[PDB]
Every structure is written in structure tokens, then in C-alpha cells.
Write a protein that binds this ligand. Sequence first.
Ligand code: NA
Ligand code: NA
Ligand code: NA
Ligand code: NA
Lengths: 244, 254, 255, 242
Amino acid sequence: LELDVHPVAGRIGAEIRGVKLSPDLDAATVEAIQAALVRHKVIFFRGQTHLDDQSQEGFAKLLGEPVTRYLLQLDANSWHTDVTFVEAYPKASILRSVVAPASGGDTVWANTAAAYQELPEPLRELADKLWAVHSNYETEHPVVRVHPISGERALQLGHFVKRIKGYSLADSQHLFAVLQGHVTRLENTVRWRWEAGDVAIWDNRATQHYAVDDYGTQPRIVRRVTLAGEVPVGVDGQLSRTTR
Amino acid sequence: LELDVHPVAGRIGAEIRGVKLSPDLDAATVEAIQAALVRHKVIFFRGQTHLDDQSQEGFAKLLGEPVAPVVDGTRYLLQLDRANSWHTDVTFVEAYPKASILRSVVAPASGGDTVWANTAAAYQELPEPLRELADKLWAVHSNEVYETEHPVVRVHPISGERALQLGHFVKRIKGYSLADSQHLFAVLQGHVTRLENTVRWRWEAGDVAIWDNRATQHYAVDDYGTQPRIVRRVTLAGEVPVGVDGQLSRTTRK
Amino acid sequence: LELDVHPVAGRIGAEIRGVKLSPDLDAATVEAIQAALVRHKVIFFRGQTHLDDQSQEGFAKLLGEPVAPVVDGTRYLLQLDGRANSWHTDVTFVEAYPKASILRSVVAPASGGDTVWANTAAAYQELPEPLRELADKLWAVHSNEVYETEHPVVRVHPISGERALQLGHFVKRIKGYSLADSQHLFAVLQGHVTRLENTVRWRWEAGDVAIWDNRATQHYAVDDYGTQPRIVRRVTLAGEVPVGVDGQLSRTTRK
Amino acid sequence: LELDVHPVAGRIGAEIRGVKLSPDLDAATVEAIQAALVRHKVIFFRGQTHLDDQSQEGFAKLLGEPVLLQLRANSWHTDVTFVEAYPKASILRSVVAPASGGDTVWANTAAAYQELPEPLRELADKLWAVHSNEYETEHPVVRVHPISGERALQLGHFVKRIKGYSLADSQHLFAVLQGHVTRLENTVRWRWEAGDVAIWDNRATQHYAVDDYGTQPRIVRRVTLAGEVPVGVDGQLSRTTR
Ligand code: NA
Ligand code: NA
Ligand code: NA
Ligand code: NA
């Protein structure tokens, strides 16, 4: 099954046409969606005007286990991967625009697998060995996560990082600056301008995101379902662990 | 005259609909375009598939004085076919361009975007003590050899808006150690490229962008691999920048 | 009264010879020591092998009001025997932090164990004027993380009138700036503090005593001596609430 | 031979007592000085007022091949690293020493390497840098010392960039590794008196001359010894490019 997929930026993001999202999509469409999600890191569905607080939650149930019973209304201008201060942080979120500012209000995603891949080999090798402490609850995650479906390596960083374990503060700051700077390099990002009825789904294991706070008092309302994820595994196979 | 203007991001950029760019636009249209340009910093016209090399050039002349190896059949049109580094155009000279008019001839199916940053918005968000510091700084800009000393803050000659004048031609902040120069640049340039002060455009063949080079920087995203990307540009002559205290930029070398 | 004063580095630090520190030092000598302290920021007295715990505490009371688990047989003497290898001004997470310490070497490593002081008045004075003007307007939050205090980045010294940067490792953030801006501005200003020309390094021998003006210095204890014993004993003197260039006072915001 | 050696800082520097430097020192003494030089990275001889330019150079010829120059250098560097075979050592004598100020600081770039966490040493072992006098040379960031085998960071102010990285990454990586070099624990500061002589191993140090003495006269006289092309951890050699 080939969906009608239209890449949005060169290294991340794709719009999927011809699909009305619903709790009654079959296992095949769910699978082609999950595959697009893995390949493109964030996928977009426009015109899901037909969709409702309950029909979104039951679409979401098809992709994983939510963490209406689960649909959260939001009514975040810092680069982050969702909830990384816990061990088994979410694998994905499904986000629907309900009220969209007429100007401003965009979201940007970064591809943390592309960010890893473009590092020179010596720097990849260092990242492979690093651990970082994330806090809001404190958890140690490897800086490089091996993705449990695709096998792709991805940088696990973002604003919940308090320090790189084993380094002085100065060194921690520099090493984080280098690696996070590859994540947010423009080439690794896609920016989406929302219209009501849009739906984005992103793979939280291989992205970061940032909500642009340029819309002043214009109302902006989105509704999110977050899917439960796995404990990350590093390149050497060690698992993330909570510490505080 | 009110053009059909649609802001693209919150702090920068606007698409103008209902206008067919040409050398024959009337005074009211040209004035409203110039006003939108100063207000929005970068403006976009989609669907200009009628606009050819000569017409793009004749249109550009309604906005200013084009400056110049050019596209055949023109005197000023430059072909670009990468600039993935934040900059303000040609700031290593004293009277750098005021504007460019850029048309998409061939646009990659995925990737190829351009981002602009509003350097007036970036100035305005600085805490007051940092604004006051920025108002006193001068920076050396270079192509390395031309070098020019510009004020860090330029007072726009039409709007009076203050704008940071930085980007990748900056060699150093004058009068500071190297370490200090790097830190102060990082702070001020960092405000320029903050996402909130930026607009990203995804090109389609026939799109035209026009930007105010006095109050922007821009960056061409190099994410499109070998997909052809061909754009053609006319650059318009600008003025010698004036700082907050009235002092003028000056070339200091070759 | 003119002491026998020998500058150690060009911009900070001076050894004072011919003086035996004690609780009975006369007022003219004490006054001259106070002046030398303000001028030189850290002063050094070698060969004070007669000084014992009680006589150090007694001497210390001549220069100020000691502040207080102390060494036995004293009220205020603190033993440090490890490590403070990070640039700081003492206790700046409180509002009225110490004005001075009097530190005596009891056991000094045969190699290593130095202390370095930086002149934060010299650091301020070397900033280009626009940067001095910015520094004059900044405030920083200092924290022991739990106490936090807002201090101006520039302190006007209450004796000399000299302006001095008030920074170091207790600084959590520069108030009113993003994290990234706070980091860069701290790095610039702290970097002038630790520039080598603004520093003096002392290698300790048992019976050495150093006195420093904590209002116009930072210091760093070099941790290069491994397991060699290092024991020093310190009396800290109470200080005043700092005053900024515009007259505003520091303020504690959490206690 | 056991010289009377007195370590100055914890991780670098030693004063050597009871030796009058001259062209006539015996082989046992010269060998012991060379050993102390390699161990301590910089060594100091005080009271060498009997020396003059000729005698300083005769003594220096016992340690290597000269390439006396009379001498502001307040920037951390290793000497002339913009050339491929930069000096192995210098011998520097104080002729006039300011009464206050005028110190020199050395850093031990072998200690700086050793203290890096293992993953960061492994990265450093793989990096190359371009050094320039703006003459440009590519040197490994880690040099394997040809006598002791100790690994040492080869950085300092002649570095223009770390090869293969963006400007931003090069800046940050340099800041990290150079920051370990100049960490106070890896340094020794010397206050000069006329007649003092310092000898340092330019393969495993950097130095900085403190500019705090105003217009006080400061006169030093230096003899520099020729050195070898550096070898990196993988055996590759430095190479001049421009
Ligand atoms: Na989020
Ligand atoms: Na450009
Ligand atoms: Na202290
Ligand atoms: Na030199």
C-alpha cells in the first residue's frame, strides 16, 4: 500500500493526501501511516474537519496506547523531545488544530536521526558513548538512541537535558551546544503553518519540536493525544534508567 | 490603495495577492508595494509565471536603481543555481544593497526553502541595557579584500526603525578582544535568528520575493541535494548606513 | 606609617614583611594593613609560625567581626582540609556576604596546593566603556543550589569607591535575560576576572597567612596536589550589604 | 645521577638546584637534565648570572641543535606550530626582570590530555587541526611524544580551525580541549629574577607571558632547539599545506 505522500522539506516532513483519519481505518492503512511516520518523522493531514474529540482519540488508539478519555486541549517555544525526563517517554503525538491564528503560531520539528547522520565519524563515535541527565523526576538516557523499529540512530537531547554525565560543566555545555546545534540546523527542520482541521503526527523517538510564540493574543487551540513509548536503548544496548 | 496583503508569520513576511508584477505598474501600486516591503520586510507574490527576465528587470527599476556575469538579454539579472549561512547582502561595502527581487525559475519538489529574519524585531526585543550597548557598537565586515566598519545598529532611512546589522560578513566587533567579540556577536546574532523573528518560504516556480536588505538577513536552506534550483535576482542600490548617533559607515580597506 | 610592602604580581597581591601578626598589634599597624588590603586586594605574611589558633582569631578581631563546626578552643576558626577549585567570591548567595578572610597555612603540600586570587576591580576597569556601562546596569541571581540573592553585577566598594565585578560560581543567572544571553554575558565578564594579568598565585609554606578583600576579589584553590595533606585555617569577617552604581542595594529573594 | 630537583606545581614544573649551567657539563648531568625536562615539562635554574649569550648557546648545544635572540606574548601557544617541524625546546634566561609583574606560565598538554574522559580522548586522537601564522600546517591534535611516548594536546593560538568541522563545531571542540590545557591545575607560574633560566619541552607544553609590568624593562634571551615532525596516535605525520 502506497499512500499519496508529498515531502514538505528535504530531510523531514511529509503531507499525506487522500486519507480521512478515523477509528475505523484498517490495519494496512494504519501500517502505511506508521511507515510514513518512521520515514518522514512528522506527517501532516489537512482537512480533517470531519474529526472530533472522540474520533481522534480512537484514531490514536490504532497507533499505540494513549497515556473523551485521553484527548488533551492546549490553548512551548523551546526545542525539546516530549517528556524525556522519564524513562519510557512517549513514542508519538497526534495533534489537531482546533483554532489557528491567522498569522503566526507555527510548529517546527527537527529530525534528530538526520542530525546524527551528518556528524563527522569521530563525533558520531563520541556521541555513541555519551549519556545525559534529563530532568523537569531525573532520568539518564544515552545521547544516541537506536530506534526500535527502524534501527536508525538519533540524538536524544533537547531542553530537558541538565548535563552530559561524566563531564565538567564547561565541557557539558560545549558538547551539548555542538550536538543540539546539529539538531536545530535549518536543513534538519520543517516548519508547519496550521489551519483548523490539520493533524500532525510525529515520531518522538527521532524528533524534537518547537512551537513558535509569534502570535501575540490571537487564540490558538490544539488537541493532543500522546502515545506510550518504550525504554530507549543505546548503541551498546544499555537502557535508560530513572535516578531521582 | 489597499493591497490584498496576507501576513505569513507573526513578526515578518506577507504574501500580496491580486498583483501581476510588470514594468507597467502604476504609482499607487508601486507605493503600496514599497510600504508593504518596509512594514513586512519580505513580501511574496505567487503565480508570476508571466514574468520573464526583461520584465523582472523592468519591474525592479520601478523600486530602485539596479546594480550589477548577468543573464543573457539583461543588464542586471543574476542567476543563482549555496547560501546556507545567515547574512545581510554585501555588508562588506559601505553602501550595500537596499533590496533584492528574486524570482523562482526552477524550484525543487522538496526542499529549497529560503528563510528571512527581521533584524528590527530582533533589536526591539533586546532588554534595554543590551539595546543601549548595541547602539554603541561597530563591527568590521569583510569579504575575506574589502573591509567596512558599520554600526551594529542601523537607523532605517525610511521608517527610522532600528535594526541589527550583523550576519556572516562580520569579522569582529571593533574595540573588543576576540573572545568578547565572539560572545557579543553570538548574543546579538542569536536574537536575529530566533525562530519567532523568522519566516520560511517554500518556493514554487513563478514565485517572486522582495526583501528589505536594511532590516533583514536571510539563509538559503541546502536540503535539496541535486534537485535543480534556479533563481534570478535583481539587486537594488542602497545608502550608506547611519547609526543611532548619526555616524556613517566607512570603508577602511581596499 | 609605611609598611615594608612588596607587590607579588603587577595588578594584585603584595607581601608585607617585618610584621608579626597577633592580637596585640598596635592600631597604626592595623590601619596600615587595612589600607594595604584595600589597595592590593590580597596581602601575604610569611613566617607567622608563632601564630596559633587563638592568636589568629584574636588578630582577626582587630580587622573586623568574625562570623561563625569550628576548630577546638576557638569560636570562629574554620579548618579546610579537603576542594575549592572553582572561581568564586565567598558566600555571595547571601545579601551581606563576608568582607574578608584571614587564612593561615598549617600543613602545605611540598608540591601543588596553590591559591589564586583575581582582582575584580581591575577586571571592571579594563572593560571598554560601553561594556562597563552595560555591567553597571546588570543584576545577577546568586544561589547556593537554599538561599538566593540578587546582587548588582558591579559593586561600589564601601571604603575605596572602586567598582568591582560581583560574579563567580554562585551566579545562577543574569536577571532579565534568556539563558543563552545570560551565559554569554557571564562568560564575557567572568572572563575578564580570570584573565591571567588580573591574578596572583601564591604557593603556601606552613605559617603563611593571606588576607583578602572579598568585596574586590575572587579566588580559586588549585587541586593539583593529590593525597598530599593540606590544612588551612580561616577566620571570616562580616561584610556589608553591597551597593550598586545607582545606589540600589542587594536583596535576598529566597531564604 | 640524582639532581637536586624540587617540583614547583603539582602537575608541572621543577626547580633544579646545584647545577651551574655551561657548555662543559658532563654527559651524566646533561642526561639527567633531559630526563627532568621530559618528566616536569619545564625546569628552572636560578642564579645563573655567570651565563652570557655565548655560554647560553654552548650549554644549549648540549641539549640539541639551535635554530641568542633577545626579547608581547600574552596568549597561550606552543612555539611556531605553523611549521611542520617546530622546536622541541627553548632555553630562556632572564637578563632584566621587572620588580613586579612579568611572570610566565606554562601548561602541561600531556596532563591536559590524560584528564579527558576516555570518549573525549578517543575523539581528540582522531582530530587534525590547521595551524597558521596569519604559512599553514596540518597537525594532529594529539602528538605522541618521540621520547616518552606520552600523548599531548597540540593546540594553542596558531590553530585556525579543526579540520573537517563547521566553524561552530571547530570553535566548541577547540574550546573544550584548549580549556583543559589552561585549567589552573595543569599550569605553573614563574616569577623571574635576573639570572634565572627556564627550559621547556615545547612538545608537551604551552606558555603565556603575563603582560602586567607596564613600562618596566624586561629582557630575556632565548635559544631555541630544532624539533621533529609530529606523529599522531595512528602514526600519521604532520604536513605543511601552504
Ligand atoms: Na511538547
Ligand atoms: Na544573499
Ligand atoms: Na572561598
Ligand atoms: Na613564544
